[PDB]
Amino acid sequence: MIFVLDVGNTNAVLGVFEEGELRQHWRMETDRHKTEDEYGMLVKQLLEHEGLSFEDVKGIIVSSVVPPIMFALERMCEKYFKIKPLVVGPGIKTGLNIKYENPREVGADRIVNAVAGIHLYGSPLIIVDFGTATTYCYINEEKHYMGGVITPGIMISAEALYSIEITKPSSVVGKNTVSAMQSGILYGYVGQVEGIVKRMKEEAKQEPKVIATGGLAKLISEESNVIDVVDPFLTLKGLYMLYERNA
Amino acid sequence: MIFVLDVGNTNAVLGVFEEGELRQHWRMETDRHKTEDEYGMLVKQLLEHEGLSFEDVKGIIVSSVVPPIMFALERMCEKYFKIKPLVVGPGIKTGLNIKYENPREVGADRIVNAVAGIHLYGSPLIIVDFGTATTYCYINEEKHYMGGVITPGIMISAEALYSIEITKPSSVVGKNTVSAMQSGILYGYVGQVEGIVKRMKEEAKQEPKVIATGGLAKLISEESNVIDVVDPFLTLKGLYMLYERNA
């Protein structure tokens, strides 16, 4: 089985693929305090409750935006799995044609998401990833990664305000402060996504399918039709594709 | 003449009204370091270059969200103008019917803006104020302040990202990082405003005129039709109305 790890500033998502299918996934807060042995012990527990052992895992790929924890995760992989993981970084092969002027500044997971999205959903595509930032990538009808749009993420924008559950209020016009802020975050974000996506489609030669991922993709897609498919595991699936290409 | 002062966390706007009309306005960064005498000396200079003296000013009203500078501004008014200013606060009379459940938690300038907007533009109204936060207030067809919507302000959201000039990029799909972020802030914000305003109008009995104010109102209104009137001096005009009612 192949173990994938997508580590964010705030959250990590783990998954195990068996015969090219996602067997199980797990989500957690990124912990800069945790040691290689405490990662190994937590992973042991996740595997055990899934009916798996370390031995079941034959390959590992990690994508991370947190250098201060890479050393420990790599050491945990080497110690518990006896495997040196593949790290998504400069010089990993992806098969992705990047026409963006800044290919090296493209987030690793935008690349991963584009590889998965094109393989799973075709082209042209708009990919919306609601994470720490909300990104919108545009892949053209020749499967070229053209670039896109970056905005503040739902939680980071909600924190800068409330300074948290993204709840639907009983009305848009908030009859009270909490209600006004709930409306603002939710409907403001929906309006943001609708507006950007409509403008990106306007610039497009062929009309693209819109796919979204990230924890809060579902909330947004419940409120709008602008998103065609929510795929919560796009990045995991992409990292699995990358592992296979690079094995 | 009547001197008005609207002091924000980040910016202050001053104005002088002569025969009920705004004669001149001045904008500046709020300075927590400045003393009462350095405020008096700066005001002296602004008046001189306008052809005015301290003596010309017979009344003063101040609205402020920065308590640490009120003492100095009040002392400057008392010393240079020989006037104790009216302060927008609990117990100032406004003539505004507030149906919002949290009347006391309504920003002073939302009240000021509503008083000015209703007097100058009628009802029902949607008032959009692009400041530190972007607020959307809804006044119903009986001129009642119903509440509204609060979102992160253009600059605070742009800072949390870039961490600045809000520029129109050459395309929505940014061909490069800076371009992607420019698109995101600008078109994301436009989409946010369009979406919220359309939802607020949907809840409205009569169809409201939409008025906007704040430094960046013009940028947004250039990009959308959702705003009927940009009135850059709504708050100044409101504070003038409040001074007159309370004199």
**Option in A148, A172, A191 nearest B174 (CB):** A148
Answer yes or no: A31 catalytic: no
Beta strands in B94-201 (DSSP E): 97-98, 125-130, 133-139, 144-152
CA distance linking residue A180 with residue B59, whole number of Å: 35
Q: How far is CA A44 from CA A33, A53, A222, in A?
A: 18, 7, 36
Question: Do the beta carbons of residue B77 and residue B84 sit within 8 Å?
Answer: yes
Helix (H, G, I), strand (E, B) or coil at B148: strand
CA distance linking residue A197 with residue B136, whole number of Å: 23
- Other C-beta atoms lying within 10 Å of the C-beta of residue B57: 20
Mutate which: B99, B134, B151, B206, vs A, most A CBs within 10 A: B151
φ, ψ of residue A108 in degrees (nearest 5): -45, -45
| Nearest-Cα residue of chain A relative to residue B105 | A177
Q: How far is CA B245 from CA A176, B47, B86, B122, B234, in A?
A: 27, 25, 11, 18, 17
Residue A13 in marked binding region: yes
| Nearest-Cα residue of chain B relative to residue A224 | B195
CA distance linking residue A17 with residue A20, whole number of Å: 6
In terms of DSSP bridges, do strands B2-7 and A144-152 run parallel, antiparallel, or are they unpaired? Answer: unpaired
**Option in B147, B171, B194 nearest A176 (CB):** B147
CA distance linking residue A12 with residue A21, whole number of Å: 20
CA distance linking residue B14 with residue B8, whole number of Å: 11
B133 interfaces chain A, CB cutoff of 8 Å? yes
φ, ψ of residue A99 in degrees (nearest 5): -100, -15
Resolution for this experimental structure (Å): 2.0
Domains observed in chain B: 1-88 (3.30.420.40), 89-247 (3.30.420.40)
Quote the minimal CA–CA distance from B114 to chain A in Å. 15
Residue B109 in marked binding region: yes
- Other C-beta atoms lying within 10 Å of the C-beta of residue A88: 23
| Nearest-Cα residue of chain B relative to residue A98 | B175
Choosing from B31, B109, B228, B231, the catalytic residue is B109
Closest CA to B149 of B135, B139, B163: B135
**Helix, strand, coil percent values for chain B (each to nearest 5):** 45, 25, 30
A98 interfaces chain B, CB cutoff of 8 Å? no
Question: Do the beta carbons of residue B112 and residue B157 sit within 8 Å?
Answer: no
Q: How far is CA B219 from CA A227, B36, B133, B169, in A?
A: 28, 35, 16, 13
